[model samples]
Target: KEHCGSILHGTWLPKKCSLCRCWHGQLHCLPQTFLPGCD
Candidate 1:
């Protein structure tokens, strides 16, 4: 429970286009799959 500032799982991490997700304490940045061609 440290990643994303201790945010909950599946929480939307605000970004420019490739929004991130919080997995409790793990950092998994999966972009270009969920959203593509976004700037």
Candidate 2:
């Protein structure tokens, strides 16, 4: 999606275990818990 006069999202490569989020254009990653561990 287009945003902030620039393209947003997927600015970096994150592991699948990270449930990433954004606020004020800041990227934050929250650890995700699963039934089995992830790599």
Candidate 3:
């Protein structure tokens, strides 16, 4: 859960029967960028 929050830059704090959106709770998993010709 920690990783998810860190990579996405957000929090998942729980609240009264609902999850709080301290920041933009959007999620995106893009491939890591690398130098050209480097596998």
Candidate 4:
């Protein structure tokens, strides 16, 4: 479930999740908030 919280930003060509390697650009978060260390 997506909580729709604040967006996280990265410092690279393509913004990616440091844990799941998911690209979020400049406005996105993990699909599930229950996932540990995903936010």
Give per-candidate clash totals: 0, 0, 0, 0
| Candidate ordering by lDDT (highest first) | 1, 2, 4, 3
- Candidate 3 shows a clash count of 0
Evaluate model 2: give its lDDT.
0.42
Off by over 4 Å in 3: 3-31
After superposing all C-alphas onto the true structure, candidate 4 shows an RMSD in angstroms of 10.2
Taking the tens digit of each residue's C-alpha lDDT, what string does model 3 give over 3-37? 33233212235322212222345544322332223
**TM-scores, in order shown?**
0.29, 0.24, 0.16, 0.18
Report lDDT per candidate.
0.46, 0.42, 0.31, 0.41
- Per-residue error (Å), model 4, residue 18: 5.6
1 or 2, which is superior by lDDT? 1
> After best superposition, candidate 1 residue 2: deviation in angstroms?
0.5
lDDT assessment of candidate 4: 0.41
Better of 2 and 3 by TM-score: 2
Tens-place lDDT per residue, model 2, 1-39, is: 732232333324653443555555664554434213553
Which of 1 and 3 is ahead in lDDT?
1
> Residue 26 in candidate 3 has what lDDT?
51
Can you write out model 1's per-residue Cα lDDT over 1-39, one digit (the tens) per residue?
A: 254532232334554444456676555554435445443
The deviation in Å at residue 7 for candidate 4 is 0.7
Give the lowest summed-lDDT range of ten residues in model 4.
18-27
Candidate 2 residue runs with Cα over 4 Å from true position: 1-16, 28-36
lDDT of 4 at 31: 39
